[PDB]
């Protein structure tokens, strides 16, 4: 889920970047450090929205670097298990359906699909129709889901969706 939190970061700066553009350069270094990343603590940060303050840069003894504890505001995207979200249907396959939850994608097996939604591989479009062909659930449809398990893969979130709950379809 999309959240807003205050985060913190400490960045290293080389002496060539001193002079009148210094604290501008500190802002540039953060904007291209912590954007679009993910963590096992906070999760997938979409962007840094603003910088709160720069803590005074502590000159490193021995080496010419200085480190700048910059506090910043971040829109973070952390899914939790059991949350009920909307998504778009990406790929309809006999092994499972693929969706996309913003920066994070999910996948739904026929196991999680009750037997009503049968396969449609004979058709040009892979869909999941029913026996009477009334409820048409194909690719590129705003199909709700429920996150039933989370998984982080090396700075990469990968949840898993399901279709067990009622009212999990077209609005």
């Amino acid at each position: 889920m999309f959240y807003h939190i205050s985060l913190e970061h400490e960045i290293l700066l080389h002496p060539r970047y001193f002079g009148p553009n210094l604290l501008n350069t500190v802002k540039q270094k953060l904007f291209t450090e912590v954007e679009g990343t993910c963590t096992g603590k906070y999760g997938f940060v979409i962007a840094v929205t603003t910088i709160d303050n720069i803590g005074a840069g502590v000159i490193q003894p021995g080496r010419g670097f200085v480190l700048y504890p910059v506090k910043y505001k971040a829109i973070v995207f952390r899914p939790f298990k059991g949350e009920v979200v909307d998504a778009v249907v990406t790929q309809v396959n006999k092994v499972g359906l693929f969706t996309e939850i913003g920066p994070m994608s999910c996948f739904i097996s026929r196991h999680s699909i009750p037997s009503e939604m049968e396969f449609d591989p004979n058709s040009n479009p892979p869909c999941y129709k029913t026996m009477d062909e009334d409820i048409v659930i194909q690719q590129d449809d705003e199909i709700r889901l429920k996150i039933v398990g989370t998984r982080v893969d090396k700075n990469d979130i990968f949840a898993i969706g399901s279709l067990m709950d009622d009212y999990l379809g077209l609005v």
Binding site: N122, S123, D132, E133, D134, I135, V136, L170
Partner: protein, 732 residues
């Protein structure tokens, strides 16, 4: 057990579900579907005409459901109305009408069942403007207009909302009949109320309530999906031009990058040319692409007066304003998205079809038979040798000879310098030492540059001027294409046939097997092995199944017309695995036949070896009777089936004035051997055989008479032309 233990064939994997059997009632519908589906965008088969192509698709599609007969089992081998009636050896495009008719019937039946269930539920709730079941029969009846069942079928069937236990302006039908009639005969609500007076049955105070309902009703309509369709997709110009970065990002390599003035581009730019559609579809993916009709500003102006009120006194003005506002709300959703989706689908399909036709044409033109043997073949054929190394793509300085029954079976060479630039006797001494100790009949080279051509010409002179061709006769290298060892040399046949040899020997064996039998080189590989050869640059943006089906149908048709040797797939490792592209013998039937004939000592004595021994089933053996040939039944090595043996033997005895045997126990007849033709062609007329086969045999012997006469006169003779110029693009 489903590939060789059933009643017949199952290898037709492109259509065996939707079109896998034909009933009586569906034969006319499938033939109409094939004739109606087979010509939509391009003028194809305008080949027989409309009635002859509809009866060729109906007669071939209704016939393939008995015994499994297809491909070399009747299409691409005779003078009759097989499918579309064209000269092509692959039937997979004529069976497309049968598969399409069967897929359309199945879809229409499911949708009709759905429409009946929904109509019953809505009627039972309504009696115990409303949505009704009246689209279910109209949709289930329209099997040909599948896309009408998508934009209008999905707008009417999705417009019910899909939930169940199991007066605002003009109507959709009137607006549709007025918009599709080119004159809006009915106006909007001609009453003294405005568009906002119907919101009192919106809760936000908004005049935009009726415009959304009108757009939702308009965008789901079958009538608008038909009315908008084929007006711009039939006739829009391909106006593709470069972007700000795309004019620099492309650099005139794609359809959008090549033409800065392409905003005036012709309507053939993606439907007649594959490259323009492929470039417009590929350039649009990364940088940008130019795809626009420019015909709506005037295609959308004439529909705005229809369904609107003609007066304006706050009665007709409100109705006319409501009609105009609802038409503008419904056009941007329904008409805008529908027009964009049809233009995009048409461009992709046109580019894919051009690429698929180019790839299928290139594969059919290159797949033909012309072995590089002596004179094109004392005995038969011989050592089809050549240099795979030297100045070409292979490293070692030497040559390998193809054995006629497969690739190369021997090789030799010598490191003598043509090496360093100061030497003139070294290359000639190596060429003489290799050519003097080996009895060839022919030469070729796997060239790759200016030094490869010079080394081939020098070796050809040293071989021709020294009598190194036959040790008492001239012969050496040239421009003949040794490059067939480039892809077949690194293959599983070249690696299993010789594992201690280098890549120069593998390339020489590949080149010498193009010199022995490229039909055995084509049939001895998987088909993965045919897709490594590029056929066009616009085939990569196309779906690969179309080129694989085109190549597979062309290869199956060329194998069914060129003859399959029964004895050649038993002993020779390079002639085996040829039972894959035969009519009524797909991978499973052919593989089971090879295993049973090698494990049991079953030899190819005649064409009834798979019918007599219980290895094959009546349907696969009847549909495959025209493709299986043997070395010895004397009509067993030809295209003569078991049912035509009596008529062909009787014709061969009647054409010579000496066939006293009645098909068995008697002198003469046409079946006595495949190497010689009958002595009299004026004795066997076509009218007598066509009249005798219609009354005793139950079939017209008009189109079959020439093939029956030729199969008795010339056994094992291929129907497809092959070869080319080795010094031009056929070998360089």
């Amino acid at each position: 057990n489903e590939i060789r233990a059933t009643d017949l064939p199952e290898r037709f994997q492109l259509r065996s579900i939707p079109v896998k059997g034909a009933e009586d009632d569906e034969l006319e519908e499938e033939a109409d579907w094939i004739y109606r589906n087979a010509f939509a965008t391009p003028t194809i088969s305008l080949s027989r005409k409309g009635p002859s192509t509809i009866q060729k698709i109906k007669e071939a599609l209704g016939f393939m459901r008995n015994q499994h007969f297809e491909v070399p089992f009747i299409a691409f081998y005779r003078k009759e109305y097989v499918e579309p009636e064209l000269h092509i050896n692959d039937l997979w495009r004529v069976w497309q009408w049968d598969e399409k008719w069967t897929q359309l019937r199945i879809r229409k039946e499911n949708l009709t069942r759905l429409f009946e269930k929904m109509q019953a539920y809505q009627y039972e709730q309504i009696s115990a403007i409303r949505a009704l079941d009246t689209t279910d029969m109209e949709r289930l009846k329209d099997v040909q207009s599948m896309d009408e069942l998508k934009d209008v079928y999905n707008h009417f069937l999705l417009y019910y909302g899909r939930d169940i236990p199991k007066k605002f302006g003009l109507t959709p039908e009137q607006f549709g009949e007025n918009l599709r009639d080119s004159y809006q005969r009915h106006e909007t609500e001609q009453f003294p109320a405005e568009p906002l007076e119907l919101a009192k049955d919106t809760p936000e105070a908004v005049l935009e309530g009726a415009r959304y309902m009108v757009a939702l009703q308009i965008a789901r309509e079958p009538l608008v999906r038909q009315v908008l369709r084929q007006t711009f997709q039939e006739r829009a110009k391909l106006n593709i031009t470069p972007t700000k970065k795309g004019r620099k990002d492309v650099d005139e390599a794609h359809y959008a990058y090549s033409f800065k003035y392409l905003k005036n581009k012709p309507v053939k730019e993606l439907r007649d040319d594959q490259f323009l559609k492929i470039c417009l579809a590929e350039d649009e993916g990364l940088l940008t692409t130019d795809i626009s009709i420019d015909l709506k500003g005037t295609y959308f102006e004439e529909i705005k007066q229809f369904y609107y009120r003609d007066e304006f006194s706050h009665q007709v003005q409100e109705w006319n304003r409501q009609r105009t506002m609802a038409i503008e709300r419904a056009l941007q959703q329904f008409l805008y998205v529908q027009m964009a989706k049809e233009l995009k689908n048409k461009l992709l399909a046109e580019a894919k079809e051009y690429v698929i036709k180019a790839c299928s044409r290139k594969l059919y033109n290159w797949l033909r038979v012309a072995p590089y043997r002596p004179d094109q073949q004392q005995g038969k054929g011989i050592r089809v040798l050549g240099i795979a190394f030297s100045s070409a793509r292979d490293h070692p300085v030497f040559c390998a000879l193809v054995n006629g029954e497969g690739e190369v079976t021997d090789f030799l060479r010598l490191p003598h310098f043509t090496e360093e630039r100061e030497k003139k006797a070294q290359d000639i001494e190596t060429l003489k030492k290799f050519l003097l100790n080996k009895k060839p009949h022919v030469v070729t080279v796997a060239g790759e540059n200016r030094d490869a051509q010079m080394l081939i010409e020098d070796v050809k002179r040293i071989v021709h001027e020294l009598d190194q061709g036959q040790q008492l006769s001239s012969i050496g290298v040239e421009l003949v294409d040794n490059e067939l060892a480039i892809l077949y040399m690194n293959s599983k046949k070249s690696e299993a046939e010789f594992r201690d040899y280098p890549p120069v020997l593998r390339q020489a064996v590949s080149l010498a097997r193009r010199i022995q039998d490229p039909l055995i080189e084509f049939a001895q590989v998987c088909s993965e092995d045919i897709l490594c050869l590029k056929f066009h640059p616009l085939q990569e943006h196309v779906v690969k199944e179309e080129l694989l089906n085109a190549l597979y149908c062309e290869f199956i048709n060329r194998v069914n017309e060129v003859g399959v040797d029964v004895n050649r797939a038993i002993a020779h490792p390079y002639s085996q695995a040829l039972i894959q592209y035969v009519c009524g013998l797909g991978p499973r039937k052919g593989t089971h036949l090879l295993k049973i004939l090698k494990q049991n000592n079953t030899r190819l004595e005649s064409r009834t070896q798979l019918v007599t021994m219980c290895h094959m089933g009546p349907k696969v053996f009847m549909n495959c009777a025209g493709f299986l040939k043997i070395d010895t039944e004397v009509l067993d090595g030809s295209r003569v089936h078991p049912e035509t043996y009596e008529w062909a033997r009787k014709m061969a005895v009647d054409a010579l004035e000496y066939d006293e045997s009645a098909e068995d126990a008697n002198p003469a007849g046409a079946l006595e051997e495949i190497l010689e033709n009958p002595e009299r062609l004026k004795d066997l007329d076509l009218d007598a055989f066509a009249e005798e086969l219609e009354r005793q045999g139950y079939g017209d012997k008009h189109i079959t008479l020439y093939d029956i006469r030729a199969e008795l006169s010339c056994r094992y003779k291929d129907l497809r032309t092959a070869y080319r110029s080795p010094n031009t693009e056929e070998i360089f």
